[PDB]
A paper describes a structure:
Here, we report cryo-EM structures of the core DISARM complex, DrmAB, both alone and in complex with an unmethylated phage DNA mimetic. The DrmAB complex exhibits a bi-lobed architecture, resembling a partially open clam shell. The top lobe contains the RecA1 domain of DrmA, while the bottom lobe contains the DrmA RecA2 domain and the entirety of DrmB. As expected for a superfamily 2 (SF2) helicase, DrmA contains tandem RecA modules (residues 600–1150) that form an active site for ATP-binding and hydrolysis and DNA loading.
Two dominant, distinct populations (~120,000 particles each) emerged during focused 3D classification; one of which had strong DNA density (DrmAB:ADP:DNA) and one lacking observable DNA density (DrmAB:ADP). Notably, we were able to separate DNA-bound from DNA-free particles through focused 3D classification, ultimately yielding 3D reconstructions of DrmAB:ADP:DNA and DrmAB:ADP at nominal resolutions of 3.3 and 3.4 Å, respectively. We observed strong density corresponding to ADP within our DNA-bound and DNA-free maps, both of which were at the interface between the RecA1 and RecA2 domains, the canonical ATP-binding site of SF2 helicase domains. Comparison of our two maps revealed the presence of a 55-residue loop in DrmA that is otherwise absent in the DNA-bound structure. Due to the flexibility of this loop, we were unable to confidently assign sequence position. We modeled this region as poly-alanine. Thus, the presence of this loop is mutually exclusive with DNA binding. Given that the presence of TL and DNA are mutually exclusive, we hypothesized that in the absence of single-stranded DNA, this loop may partially occlude the DNA binding site, preventing DrmAB from loading onto non-phage (i.e., host) DNA. In the absence of DNA, the DNA-binding channel of DrmAB is occluded by an unstructured ~50 residue loop within TL. I In the absence of phage infection, DrmAB complex is autoinhibited via TL.
Author numbering:
A (entry chain A): 13 to 713, 723 to 1317
B (entry chain B): 5 to 75, 88 to 267, 335 to 397, 405 to 619
Amino acid sequence: AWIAIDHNFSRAQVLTYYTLQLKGEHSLHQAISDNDWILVLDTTGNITRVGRILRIRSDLETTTIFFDRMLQVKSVVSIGITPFKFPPNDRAGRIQWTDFIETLPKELHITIADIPKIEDQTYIRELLQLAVMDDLLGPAGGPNELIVDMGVRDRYLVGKLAPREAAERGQEFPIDAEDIEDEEPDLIVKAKTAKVNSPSVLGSGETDTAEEIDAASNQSLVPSSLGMTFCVDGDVDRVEIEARWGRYERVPNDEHQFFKSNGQKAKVWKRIPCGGKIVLPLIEGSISHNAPDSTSPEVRVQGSIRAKNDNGDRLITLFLVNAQEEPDTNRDTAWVFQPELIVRAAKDAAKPAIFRRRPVLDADGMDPEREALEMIYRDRVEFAVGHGVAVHAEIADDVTLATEVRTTVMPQYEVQATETPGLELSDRPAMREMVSSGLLDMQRLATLDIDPLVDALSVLTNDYATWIDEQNLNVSSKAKGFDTQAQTAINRCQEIHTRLQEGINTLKSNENALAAFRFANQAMATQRIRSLYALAMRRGEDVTLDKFDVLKNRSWRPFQLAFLLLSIPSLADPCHPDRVKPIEAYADLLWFPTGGGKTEAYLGVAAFTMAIRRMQGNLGGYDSSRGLTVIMRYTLRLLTLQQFQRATALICAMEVLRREALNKGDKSLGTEPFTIGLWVGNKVTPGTTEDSHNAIEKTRNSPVQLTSCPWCGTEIVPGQDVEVKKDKAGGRTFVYCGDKKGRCEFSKGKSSTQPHPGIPVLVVDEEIYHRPPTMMIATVDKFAMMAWRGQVRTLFGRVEKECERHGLLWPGANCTGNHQAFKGQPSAKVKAIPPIRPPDLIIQDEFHLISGPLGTMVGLYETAVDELCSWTLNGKTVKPKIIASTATVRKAKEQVNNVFMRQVSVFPPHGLDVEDNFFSVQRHIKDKFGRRYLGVCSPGSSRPAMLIRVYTAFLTAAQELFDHFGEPADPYMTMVGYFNSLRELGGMKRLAEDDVQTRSYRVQMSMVERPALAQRSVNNIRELTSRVSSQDIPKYLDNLEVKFKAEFDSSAGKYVTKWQEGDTRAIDVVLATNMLSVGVDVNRLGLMAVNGQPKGTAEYIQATSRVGRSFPGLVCTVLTWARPRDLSHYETFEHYHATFYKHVEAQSVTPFSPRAMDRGLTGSLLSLMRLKNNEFSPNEGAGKLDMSNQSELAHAIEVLATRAGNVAEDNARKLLAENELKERADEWAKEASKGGRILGYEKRGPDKDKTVALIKSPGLQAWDNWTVPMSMREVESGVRLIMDTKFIKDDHDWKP
Amino acid sequence: NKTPVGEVRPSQLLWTYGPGALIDLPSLSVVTLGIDRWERERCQPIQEARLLAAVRKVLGPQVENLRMPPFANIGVPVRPFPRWMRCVKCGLLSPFDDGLLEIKEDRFRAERTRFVHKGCTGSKGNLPAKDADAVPARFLLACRDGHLDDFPWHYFVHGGNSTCKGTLRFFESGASLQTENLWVRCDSCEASRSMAHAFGKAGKENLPACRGRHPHLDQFDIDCGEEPRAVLLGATNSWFPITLSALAIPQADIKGPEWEVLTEANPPTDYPHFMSKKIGTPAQFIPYISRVLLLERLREVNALLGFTRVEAPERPQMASLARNKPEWVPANQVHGEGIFIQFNEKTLVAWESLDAVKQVDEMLRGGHTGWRNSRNLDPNEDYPGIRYAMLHTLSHLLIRELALECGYNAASIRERIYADTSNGSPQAGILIYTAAADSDGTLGGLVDLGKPENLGRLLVQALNRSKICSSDPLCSEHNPEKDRSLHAAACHACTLVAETSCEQGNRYLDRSLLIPTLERIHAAFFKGF
Ligand SMILES: Nc1ncnc2c1ncn2[C@@H]1O[C@H](COP(=O)(O)OP(=O)(O)O)[C@@H](O)[C@H]1O
């Protein structure tokens, strides 16, 4: 019941809506408390707002009031009719209750219970941030607070300086023995037990392991000083320095009335403010010691000042040291809490902006990419650096000058949001024309005639050319000092426009291309509609198909269509220059912020490639109506299994349209269907049909890699939906849909007559090596199997013979193509067939992880993959097309030339600014929210103590926000914890369900005052990692989408949850390693707590970007003082978070070094020797190397030496490779002529009693020439520990 | 009678674990046994004579060979330690061999083995009986001379000797904010005490004398006059190794022929495991650096001889591996690559005879004399010199910058310094090679940075970072004559590396010998940077 007067002091708009700010210390305003109504006016005397108070905070000059319910008056109401008194002398004034209650309906047309509640969520993220800041940093009870029943040093976690005597001797334990000696024992002890646990954890388990590391202690350290470093302009004389801190003092017993449980008095401390301002002349030399506050003269400020530099500025360093002395009783009165330093200009200067850039720190070397990066980021300027603390600067109107600098203990910074233009009212008019008239509709673009097609596609290129035209007015005007880079930027955009027009021209002068374009658009639109229906059905909701067929769902995004038009002319003709010459063959590289659709961008190219290949014909004497087309290869193991589900839907839609087209007599698409297979290790998938039978046999008393049907969403039961045909030499495994009525096209009622019935997949390896699919999704490490197994050459199309009953044949197989009549099937005979065309496209994802030893090992084995996929056409040699995709680009040119041996073409190009390139727009904080970051660094404490405290603070502050506001707090009620290793996650897992629940239950059960936290019950904990079984993963991902349920109780006056019988519970804490493989854009998750700085920048950007996509996000990185990388990042926090891409760590890919030639050379030689010829294909081919076969050895040797010379660009490497290959070839040549034995590759088969092996495996012996690896990475096998359990008696006894 | 528990990489058996070390597994903790109870017939020998003749001089002529780690029950033998545990549900403290604790296992998935408290009924004892999990207790008792033994719980809780035979519990603070406090309570005597009274100055008045227990040998000494110290479980100051390593060079100190071979006019390249290139020298560093040599193929063998407990080693404080004089020692070998930097002789001799260098040398020798007095050793021997501190500091900074710039792991990189000046063949140079066989920058990644385009940038950034430390006024004011340290102006936040990488143990390091610092100017070796 108060009346105040507004004066509009606060700056941020969201804060100014929901707050009232008063002047003066809170000691005058002690009559105002929580749950109070205040009625806010303006200066003239007009009623504007009516609100209710949530919280009060205070400072040395101002007090801020936060609301929880508020009404905004729309009309104009005067104070004259109000019976009340005007505010006394612009302070607070008391309201009579009755007149306020009577006037609320009379002159405001409202009651108490009709007040609407606050709905914004930026307000809520602000309140949560303030709560955690108060509880971890302080002061919490104001500047004149009282602390009861505990010591001041352990109350707070961050930002405290020790006296100098303590810092030299260090620590051995968090608690000193002499400071705890009370008369009584600690009476508030409780038994150290997992009390009332009820963990409700699923407790899934498996087998996995990771790496390990170590560091020095975080216990034996405490600092006693902090500083900064700033560079100042010349021709000035003096500056102003302000320092403030806080001090604590013990209140004697007769002065308070706070009692313990047993009637005795308790310890009470009190806080007093400190600090003052000084003025310092600018003379070269070390600064004299000075004391700002006279009452504590033994705390200082110091530094040094250096001479003038080459430009006209000066370097100045400043510190702040505690040099006090340690007493014997009440040792905490010599510690300094909450320090801060401010440096500004003098009070009487003419111009304030005197702080300039740090010197560039040049090193007499230039890299054009680096200068381009400095040109792009020219409005992010780094002014100062902190020593044992973080820093902050205030930027003037000029973006190269600053007026104020200071220090921050826990720093924050908010990042702008990348979006695609087209929806806002301030974008380019042509994009709004495209959206409003519907020229990106995928159904519309498949039915247009050719001339309206050119009309529609021309607008994009016209507007791109226009944008480049206004980009050229500012070469020397706005980019001063960077003329060379401002020209090289425009050159590549002009090349991009040229290639777009070339693509449209190729589309105009062809008919196969137009047919393929229409086919790809139709298939993509259908799959895009149906995937959402499948996801809705699998979760058990009730939906129909016509709900999802609206215009929102079947439209393109401009960079995807642009990539498609770029990609056309190289695939529509094998005679294009990109595929016939070894120089200037541009390999496209696509990079973009994560969240935009790169995956649907690069799946359309595969669809177009698949459709166009069957419309060409048997060019060059090669078959072209069947065989493998597109290879799609990845690095990890789990993301492959996640992407296979996405690829199946496209294959299904293509099969549907192929089946519907043939019914009209149109045979352009052919007869053979489209199928897709995996190619991963033998742990996940079976090898032969016998094992596929064994798995189903063991099931009824694993080829089932699918859980639900892609096309319809019916549950797949493994018991009855699998058929394995009998196998005298080989069989075919089929998987059917689980529909019972018979309306799905992939059930047993409809598809039984097709050449490939049911779901068109392949899982078994020998099934793939007989009928090769159209598409393949593999992992990198499987490619090392080429030198072992000789039947892989079917995948590249090197075949001769075929059996009608089994499939394609290789030398040394079971069936030779002849049979008798049996089960009534007619007898058949073998036939000969011309060869098949090798694949056309290679696709690589997560290309930034191809670096280091993995990158080198990929690069050396890629000599064979490029060689085997080649062929001839009119004398020329045709080579495949390569596409890669990354998240961060850095030194891409050398990486692509070393791995793939091509040129590079990064799309989309740079532009002159980081904010306004053509296809992306980096929006503004005033109009769309961002992703705030926050940082915590603290010495002394252990890593478990910091983790427990941060987790408890977030969990209990979120609950307090829930209790007053309701359902908008839902994003911040479930906490995600991201980790870097399995061992540390295992360590934290024990602490999660034992300690945090106990510390969160008893959060308000002592006499210490905690203003913001609240009572919370923790019940549910899950975990997402590689040790979770693959059947259970989609159940956990589908559990994360349930919301916390709320209900309003008028007895307590708040909201409360209640869970009915047989209902699912929401999850409280979720823990996730590297594999944060979130399936969809999960709308709930909006709070993550990173635990430790990752070893890479790309990983940090990938992991932290998942949270906060539909609601505002908030990340808190927890850093440790004892590690170098963490401290280095802490001191430079606010600059690293504004220039991400400038700071990407280095990489290297170097095959053909001696250490990599000692590993990969024999494997590559044998792979090229085996998978290309017929005499060396079978297992007994090792003895065949005669004096008549050596001409193929020369071919392989020449290929390897040529690539080594072309990539290393030095003749020494070529000479070295030639010598190594010659030695290996001669070593092979000696072993052939040793008669008396039968020589082969492995000891295998019934002839093994006289077989002598040639090559080996990594085992007991040291490495050799003939050791051939089985993966791209190996650790030597470990040693196992052998426990002993027994009893030993201890007769010996202790003594003083 | 035996069962598997887990596995570890063969690298860690000679640098972190090994015959005497605590192993903190996910479910339990064990201590590796000695080597005369190892399976000798399943260890593959390693052929290296130049290191065998060095081990035989130290440990006597009876040493036979160097042997690799032993490799369906073949493995390294362990035994549970500490032999007291805690219960999660009832909070009970009791040794393993009273009979109240039982062991569960599953053989196919041996990482899930743990101990159980059979028939737990609650603290008061009013719930249906079940099985709960048992975890070790996390404090031990360490003796400087080499002994480790269980913590004396009964004597500590009863304030000395007592006749009681009750049971014990743990209690916590019961507040939401205190986190580290512990309490021990007797069920019959109600004697209560806290764990804070075992560390610091109060520890001397409260803990009893050492008993003399070598756990890995199952053997007790008669008496031990040293004073004891309490240590945590898994802390880094509980086991230190003694190592002796050599480089495989073509063909009586170890490091003599290494310097003779590496600085020849034409370093040989006909041996399989030694191949070298002479690429370049940077632009700003002409007067100081004379030769920079790259190694494309390198090979290093190791050995293990002993251990020490509380303090790093500097021979009566070292503890053996076996019951008698041993007959073989563990060994290892790694194939890798390295970078060799040589420095100019005349520039160094000019810099050795200045004034501030002599003052800093006098300060360090006073500190060395102060250190060696407090441990009853000869105080006029084994001083390295002043050249050693400068080269050694530069090496530590270079390793830190290799980790910071390239994203490597810190433990992956090892140093080796050459600064002997006693026999009239002066030395100056550092070496840096690779630690593990599967580490960062293994396949030609380190030799990439040996080219003159990258090394100069790395050096410039390394030297320009170390101008002001993060704990700065107190770091440069540090004086080792006052309190007998072996370092001056070299703290954790500017100079020290992990114990795996370091060759000496963070002794004899000082950074003001390299650049101007906040208190000294005229002692620098690199001027104008
Ligand atoms: N044309 C489109 N219209 C609307 N949303 C789209 C479109 N294309 C993709 N998306 C959304 O973007 C997501 C694609 O993300 P993804 O392509 O996997 O990112 P990246 O592959 O770049 O990491 C899909 O889940 C989908 O919801």
